[PDB]
């Protein structure tokens, strides 16, 4: 239903998900020289998203503020776990452990995306409560 024409939150979440996606479809054949920049993009997209959400909170019912702040915390956490696996992956480049580390990377990145989508869902519900839906 919602018009996304100027929904920056929805626009950033889309961007973060697309970043998590390009990183994922490109990870296996990639060297650390190619995937560190890739994670750096995911991070820039996440930072941009949280900034936007930070400016949107003031326009939403205070009753919703904490559920949003938690979803926000959760995301920084996922970037944390993703950055971690990325480092392990770098360390074990060229080793029998390189694959299990990129796989955990995909798992961290995917979780990040799932958690950004849920934030979009929490924030959409708070807009519905404001806009006054039946």
């Amino acid at each position: 239903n919602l018009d996304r024409s100027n929904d920056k939150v929805y626009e950033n979440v889309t961007g973060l998900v697309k970043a998590v996606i390009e990183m994922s479809s490109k990870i296996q054949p990639a060297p650390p020289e190619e995937y560190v920049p890739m994670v750096k993009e995911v991070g820039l997209a996440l930072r941009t998203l949280l900034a936007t959400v930070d400016e949107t909170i003031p326009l939403l019912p205070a009753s919703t503020h904490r559920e949003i702040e938690m979803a926000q915390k959760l995301l920084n956490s996922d970037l944390g776990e993703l950055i971690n696996k990325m480092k392990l992956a770098q360390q074990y480049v060229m080793t029998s452990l390189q694959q299990e580390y990129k796989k955990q990377m995909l798992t961290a990145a995917h979780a990040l995306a799932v958690d950004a989508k849920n934030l979009l869902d929490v924030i959409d519900q708070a807009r519905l409560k404001m806009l006054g839906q039946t």
Binding site: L2, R4, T14, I21, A113, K117, L120
Partner: peptide
Amino acid sequence: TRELDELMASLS
């Protein structure tokens, strides 16, 4: 969100 769902789907 139907287009964002094409994405959410890409990761399964």
